[PDB]
Each structure stands twice: as structure tokens, then as C-alpha cells.
């Protein structure tokens, strides 16, 4: 049997009771990550299907503990809000988009995260298909492409997310969104098999050079694709 009311009331009402009498702030920050990691580990083993009543109070409490904390490695704080956001995806309530996307900025600034930043940054454009806010897209590929070109971020599926990044700006924009997007996919056929690149890579390799501005980029951008042996094999080479 488990009521979980007294359980959430003990920790929910007793957080710094031992830290209020000790006037010497020890600022341990060493076993706190292990304690919070143990809490999210036990709640991770009891998070799938146990009881639907206490989970909303536990989650609504820990997401407030994210704001009340203000000092963490910003790993578990993102873990609870993304494992809650995944539930909110199929739950049908998109009102939390301002919460996850508003707190994501706080959860991505103040620390050095290389691998977790890309694995957790997909939430910026995940619910954007349901939100479709133009100003939000203007704030967040701006906040997305701050400092990252190739390095310090490895997965394998990198090109897939690359296609998943600026295609929504192509949905918001009209033509200029792919001018800088379709010009950087030349390394995509080198990473994976070139069999399927004829339909997507070698097809989008001409859209950005046709839709390029007629002032200066048309003069020099036409020389980057010239010389490739696969260019003449396309029937559109005459076009």
C-alpha cells in the first residue's frame, strides 16, 4: 500500500530544516547531485505506472523546485521537465509550451553543456509545430545557432536534425530560409549512403542557387557546385 501524501509532505515541507540552524553555509554541491539523482532515479522506477493521483502533485512540486533551486548542473532539472513534456505531448495540453520553452533558456545558460544541449535542444522546435508562433521562431533559430558549426557535438543522426532545424523556418519564411540551409548539405552524402541522396541532396542542391539573390551571391555561389561529376548525371543539368 502507498498513499504518498505523507511522503510528499515530509520532503515538500522539510527542505532546509537542517540548513537553517547551521550558520556556516557549506554549499556542498557534491552529494546534492547524488541525492537529487537518487530521487529522480527512484521516481524514474516509480514513474511509469503506479498511481495517477500523486504524480501530478510530485511533478508540480518538482517543477517549482526547479525555480526555487537556481543552482544545479541543469541536467535533472531538464530531465523532469522533458519527461513531463513528453507526457504533455500526448496529453493534449499545449499550454505548457511557454513553461518548457521559457524555462529552457534558464536551463541552457550558466553552464557548459555539449552533448546534453543538442539532445535537449530539440524541444525548442518539437512543440513549435503545434505552437506556430512567428516571433518565437524569430527568438529561439537565433538562440539556436549562437556558436555551433561542426565540433563538440556528436550523435550520427546529426544531418537529420540539421534538416529538422531550418525547414520550419522554410515553413515560416518563403525562399531565403533555404539559401543558407541547402548550401551546407554537401557533407551529408559523405556521411551516409549516396543512394538516397539523389532524391533529396542532389535535388535541393539547385534550389538555393536558383533562389539565390541576383546581386552578388549568384556570381560566386554557382562555382561551388560546378565541377562535381554527379551534377551532369542529373537530367536538370541542362536547366
Amino acid at each position: 500500500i502507498l498513499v504518498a501524501v505523507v511522503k510528499m509532505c515530509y520532503e515538500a515541507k522539510e527542505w532546509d530544516l537542517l540548513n537553517e540552524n547551521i550558520m556556516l553555509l557549506s554549499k556542498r554541491r557534491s552529494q546534492l547531485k547524488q541525492a537529487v539523482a537518487k530521487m529522480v532515479q527512484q521516481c524514474c522506477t516509480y514513474v511509469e505506472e503506479i498511481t495517477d493521483l500523486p504524480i501530478k502533485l510530485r511533478l508540480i512540486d518538482t517543477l517549482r523546485m526547479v525555480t526555487e533551486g537556481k543552482i544545479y548542473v541543469e541536467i535533472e532539472r531538464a530531465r523532469l521537465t522533458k519527461t513531463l513534456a513528453t507526457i504533455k505531448e500526448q496529453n493534449g495540453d499545449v499550454k505548457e509550451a511557454a513553461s518548457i520553452l521559457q524555462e529552457l533558456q534558464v536551463e541552457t545558460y550558466g553552464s557548459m553543456e555539449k552533448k546534453e544541449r543538442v539532445e535537449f535542444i530539440l524541444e525548442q522546435m518539437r512543440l513549435c509545430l503545434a505552437v506556430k508562433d512567428y516571433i518565437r521562431t524569430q527568438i529561439i533559430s537565433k538562440k539556436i545557432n549562437t556558436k555551433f558549426f561542426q565540433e563538440e557535438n556528436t550523435e550520427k543522426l546529426k544531418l537529420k536534425y540539421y534538416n529538422l532545424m531550418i525547414q520550419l523556418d522554410q515553413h515560416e519564411g518563403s525562399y531565403l530560409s533555404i539559401c543558407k540551409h541547402y548550401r551546407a548539405i554537401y557533407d551529408t552524402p559523405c556521411i551516409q549512403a549516396e543512394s538516397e541522396k539523389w532524391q533529396q541532396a542532389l535535388k535541393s542542391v539547385v534550389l538555393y542557387v536558383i533562389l539565390a539573390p541576383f546581386d552578388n551571391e549568384q556570381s560566386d555561389l554557382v562555382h561551388r557546385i560546378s565541377g562535381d561529376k554527379k551534377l551532369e548525371e542529373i537530367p536538370k543539368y541542362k536547366d
Binding site: 556556516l24 557549506s26 554549499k27 556542498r28 554541491r29 557534491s30
Partner: protein, 313 residues
Amino acid sequence: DYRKKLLEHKEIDGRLKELREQLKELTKQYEKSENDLKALQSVGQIVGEVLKQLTEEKFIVKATNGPRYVVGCRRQLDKSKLKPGTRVALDMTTLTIMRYLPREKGCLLYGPPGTGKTLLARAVASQLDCNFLKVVSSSIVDKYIGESARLIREMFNYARDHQPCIIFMDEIDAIGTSADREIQRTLMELLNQMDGFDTLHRVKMIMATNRPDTLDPALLRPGRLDRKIHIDLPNEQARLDILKIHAGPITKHGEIDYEAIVKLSDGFNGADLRNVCTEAGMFAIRADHDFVVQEDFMKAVRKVADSKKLESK
């Protein structure tokens, strides 16, 4: 008869082709000698400074000796460096111009138990520092009336003019009546030259102390030292890592236990543990042997580490 002449002639050709390397290496330096002799032909240049420019082609120069002159514009250079305010060079003949002459955010790491955090700054500086700019806490004696404001503005001004600037403050407990007025003066100057339009992305400083009661509650306030990290456990995992990746070139006995040497030498730092192991090497080199019995190693750990614990005042 015939098969051996190929190997023999290969030997004569070998000793014949192995003598060119003894000369072709020094012929490059010999030719470099005449290259320098042809490079020392550009002589007779003088310096000058520009204050006021009337004509875009011809301006006024100021020599270091004191007399002033006026020069022209050379067909090779452009008007980029010709603007005033940049020290340039001149020639003795025709006073032509060859080229110009260029003139010349916070983290607190304190541990309430034990000492040796300055040696932690020696560990980080010995790991990756790449910027040499040290400031000692014994330069603010202020035995005069007290004018360290221009010392702070001039020091951080040299930190703006000098890109490499990573400071490691230490021994601040003895400098931390009007004993606090100078601390509020220099600290308020630190805020006055750290909270405004200061290059925080280039400057860096680390403050160290020795006692938990003299922590300078003014420095304990946020701002000055935002990143605060306690030293209660001296990073036993990072200590073991420092011992592993710093125990490479030092050769010791075959049977060696890292956990025992780590556990018997704690409290200060892992780089100090590296000083204990290199001290055990400083005694193994006295015992003119590469590997010795761990008894002397335990004498360096117990006697040297406990000597650090006793004489670490």
C-alpha cells in the same frame, strides 16, 4: 660470383650515398649566413611620433631626441597607418617612411578545513593557464596616505592593453581601526572597474585564503566572487586522476597501490600528492635505485605529508 657483386656494389653505393648528409645539412646554415649578410643591408632608420597632420600627403613628425621634422608619403604605403596617433619610423636619407612602430570573470576556491588552496591554483595553472600575469597581495601595503585607486585603474588598464591576464590572488588572510577602510577602498574600486563597461571576457582572477574566520565578508558578498566552491573533500576522484595521468614518467616499484597513497595523503590537493610521489622519487634518486621498497615511500608519504600537515601554517 655474379650475385655478390650486386650486394657489394650496393655497399659501395651505400657508403657513397651516406656521406652527403654530413654536408648538405650544414650547407643550408652556411648559405643562411650569406642570407643574413644580405639581410643586414637595411640600416640607418630612426623613429618618430605624429601629433598634428595638416596635409593628407605630408604631416609633422616628432622625434624622440626632441627636434621635430616633417616628412612625406611613400608610394608603397597607404593612408591606413598614416593617420595621427600611431608611432612610425623614418629614414636618415630623404626622411622616407618604411613602416610603423606599435607602442607597448571571478571564482572563489576556499576550503574551511585545512590549507593549500594556493597550491590548487598552482594545480590549475600547471594544468592549463596559458596567460602569465601574477599579482601578489603584498603590493597593497599602503604605508603612504592611500592612493591605490590609480594602481587598480593602471593595473587593469595594463590588463586591457595586455591580452594575457589570469591572476591568482593568495595570502589575503593577513591583509583582511582603519584596517577595513583600505579593503573597502580597493574592493569598491574593483566593483568600479568590474561592473561597468569592463572586458570581463578577457580578465580572470582567483582569490585564495587560509582561514575560515577571516573570509572577508565583503568578499563573501556576490559580485566580486560569484563562483564559490568549498573544499571539504579534496576531489578524491580528481586526486586519483591527477595521480594516474601525472604518475607516467616517474618509475616506481612494481607492486604499487594508488588507493593507499591517495588515502594516506589527503586534505591539501592532488598536485601536492604529486609532490609527495616526486618527493619519493627525490629520495629514490638519493638511494641511487630506480625501484625501491615501499618502506621509504611510506617514509616520504608519512614524514613528508605529515610534515606538510604540521608545517602548513
